[PDB]
């Protein structure tokens, strides 16, 4: 009775938002950018290969200086690299070796890691002693942490597999905001450049636009047919790209509240592990699990290059702040910097 | 290179040496993933052999064991089961005293049928093609005391055999081992345990020595 009425109301609201997003769909992004100049071929080459990890890489993150990057691997290690000279600054031994995410603070004073222990551990790099010690162990999640991103030296947004994203206060150790709207496990995070709102791709084939201060979901994006493993904003902050297990990448517009372009090929039947945009937003770099990364034209949905060179599944990739280099991590325990 | 650059190179060399030593020490270790049902009973196994996941460390005859318990992970296991692709063995604990029971959640399957479905999912997974499974059949005393009253026809209706302890236990073991679709690149080791018995660590030691011999033969190229 009441449940049937609520289901009918939900179906009516879903049809209303579908009709509203259909009414604002006069043209398509492929048709508008059909008369722009295509980029020919992006031939990137491996400059530095970072060796030293002994198990599979699950996460890497760049620093804001575009030189220092941190990597996480299942050997219980968190290596901070100097990408210019290819040498190690720090080797952090983790209490739990089942790391699934890593983050680099914008100030560079801290790094984060987490995984199957359901704990976001924050490490102080710049101590009076020469070691890197654990600052905090944020423990309030039920499931495994999938992604963590730093807002400042005191705030960090974590995505977990217990169908929950959380915002933490590091000094207190408690969580201030609990983002609860999903249905499946949240697998990816992306912070906007202005650091006020973030998107989260989960296992219900949905991406939700959250508000950091308000704590409520603003938009829901339902175009995929499988588990979303990767998410990343456009540099403008008005769009983002998703990478799922149905071998497709999709670009979603925040203001139009729907999907603009699908980055798919018939020769690809394998999922996407990591996505990242270029500095200009023209190139979308997606790391697949057919052992290589594919460079996509973000305005024309055409492949511009292939970053072949990894012997196993490319699990993590990131583009620097200045856009000079792309570092790809994979399950063959190697990090390669492309330029 | 400057003086500070040379000293940074030396620091990186020291870090590399420490990483290599830790990697060799970890490669000489044995990693086990412990799996089972909620009512199958795994805490007695950890007690005999000694949120998030639980790591149990114990040393038996100059071998360092690492036992990982993922039973508290109430998430989609397809998104983290590849983290255990490199593992020496999987320990699957099945109580055979709950063939007559049913799940506390809902009645749509038996407990033994749920254990069989989990075994079929784990054994035939894409990440565990060459990973051996050590099978424990726990609570054999309750199974002996319950097979006299309740027959095994309740769980497996196509049994048609003697209702003794040995034939029923062998039929349960055969039904669990018949779900091994690979049967050519992995082995299933079966033990019958009980609470008042301290012999399970020896069984795990013998099985892991077999797995170590097979892995050394594979690394030598002889398989």
């Amino acid at each position, epitope marked *: 009775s009441e449940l049937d009425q609520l289901r009918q109301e939900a179906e009516q609201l879903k049809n209303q938002i579908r009709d509203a997003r259909k009414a604002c769909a006069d043209a398509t992004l492929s048709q508008i950018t059909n008369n722009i100049d295509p980029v020919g071929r992006i031939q990137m080459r491996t400059r530095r290969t970072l060796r030293g990890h002994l198990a599979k890489i699950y996460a890497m993150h760049w620093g804001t200086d575009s030189r*220092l990057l941190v990597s996480a691997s299942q050997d219980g290690k968190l290596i901070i690299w100097d990408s210019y000279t290819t040498n190690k*600054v720090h080797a952090i031994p983790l209490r739990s070796s089942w790391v699934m995410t890593c983050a680099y603070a914008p100030s560079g004073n801290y790094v984060a890691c987490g995984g199957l222990d359901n704990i976001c551990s924050i490490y102080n790099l710049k101590t009076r002693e020469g070691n890197v010690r654990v600052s905090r162990e944020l423990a309030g999640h039920t499931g495994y942490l999938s992604c963590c991103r730093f807002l400042d030296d005191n705030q960090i947004v974590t995505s977990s597999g217990d169908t929950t994203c959380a915002l933490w206060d590091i000094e207190t150790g408690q969580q201030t905001t609990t983002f609860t709207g999903h249905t499946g496990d949240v697998m990816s995070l992306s912070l906007a450049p202005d650091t006020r709102l973030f998107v989260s791709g989960a296992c219900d084939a949905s991406a939700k636009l959250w508000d950091v201060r308000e704590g409520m979901c603003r938009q829901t994006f339902t175009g995929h047919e499988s588990d979303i493993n990767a998410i990343c904003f456009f540099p403008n902050g008005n769009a983002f790209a998703t990478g799922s297990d149905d071998a497709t990448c999709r670009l979603f517009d925040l203001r139009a509240d729907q999907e603009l372009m699908t980055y798919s090929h018939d020769n690809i039947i394998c999922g996407i592990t990591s996505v990242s945009f270029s500095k200009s937003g023209r190139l979308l770099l997606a790391g697949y699990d057919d052992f290589n990364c594919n460079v996509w034209d973000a305005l024309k949905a055409d492949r511009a290059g292939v970053l072949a060179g990894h012997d196993n599944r490319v699990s993590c990739l990131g583009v620097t702040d200045d856009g000079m280099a792309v570092a790809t991590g994979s399950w063959d325990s190697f990090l390669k910097i492309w330029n | 290179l400057s003086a500070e*650059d040379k000293a940074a190179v*030396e620091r990186s060399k*020291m870090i590399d040496r420490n990483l290599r030593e830790d990697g060799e020490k970890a490669a000489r270790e044995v990693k086990l993933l412990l799996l089972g049902a909620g009512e199958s009973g795994k805490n007695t196994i950890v007690k005999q052999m000694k949120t998030g996941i639980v790591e149990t460390h114990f040393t038996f005859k100059d071998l360092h064991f690492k036992m990982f318990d993922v039973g508290a992970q109430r998430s989609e296991r397809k998104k983290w089961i590849h983290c255990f692709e490199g593992v020496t063995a999987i320990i699957f604990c099945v109580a055979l005293s709950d063939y007559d029971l049913v799940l506390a959640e809902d009645e749509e399957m038996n407990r033994m049928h749920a254990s069989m479905k989990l075994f079929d999912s784990i054994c035939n997974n894409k990440w565990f093609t060459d990973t051996s499974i050590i099978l424990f059949l726990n609570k054999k005393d309750l199974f002996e005391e319950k097979i006299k009253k309740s027959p095994l026809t309740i769980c497996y209706p196509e049994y048609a055999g003697s209702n003794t302890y040995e034939e029923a236990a062998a039929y349960i073991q055969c039904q669990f081992e018949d779900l091994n679709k690979r049967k050519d690149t992995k082995e299933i080791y079966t033990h019958f345990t009980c609470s008042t018995d301290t012999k399970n660590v020896q069984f795990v030691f013998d099985a892991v020595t077999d797995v170590i011999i097979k892995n050394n033969l594979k690394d030598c190229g002889l398989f």
Partner: single-chain antibody
Amino acid sequence: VQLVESGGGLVQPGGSRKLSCSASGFAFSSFGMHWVRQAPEKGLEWVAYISSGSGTIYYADTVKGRFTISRDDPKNTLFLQMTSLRSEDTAMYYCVRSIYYYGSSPFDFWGQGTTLTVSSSDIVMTQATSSVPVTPGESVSISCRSSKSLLHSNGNTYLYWFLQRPGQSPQLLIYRMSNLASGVPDRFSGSGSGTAFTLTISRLEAEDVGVYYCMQHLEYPLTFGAGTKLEL
């Protein structure tokens, strides 16, 4: 963090004496160690250096072949064995820690000091100013000049500034050119290009009066400069 060193005293010329430094408060194994001596009226002078892991050992030309530097990592102890002492070795000896990676702050902590008394192709860092009369609340620009260009090809200018208060060990202010050290107030600043440098203080209290030293870390043997005293 404290480096307490003991030993020395009154020794005859031609004798031998061992200086030991005890470290407590930091990871001793990950820090390179230095010995810096200072004559009773003169400035600082580098003596020796032992790297982390004891793989790289360097000596000054004055004490080469006669001084031995060693460390005891499990015991957190640094040793300096001196052989064939002269009257030129009469100095106060400091143990200095220095870590080396990208963005590190070498020469950050200095030990207390041991008074040793003995009975009777290098970059020349020049500080022409000496004993400048300074009133508080003003701005002071201490200048340093180098005989070689300290700007390396990697964009790093290895110029180190130190402040020695009277009766205290010297304290690092600026480690690389325009890099304020930890615990140093923002009034201190540093700038330069190539061989000419300056250290600018915006407004100064009675805390920052002493002898200001200039050091290069471009290449060994790490020559200092004669200090510029600031008196009230």
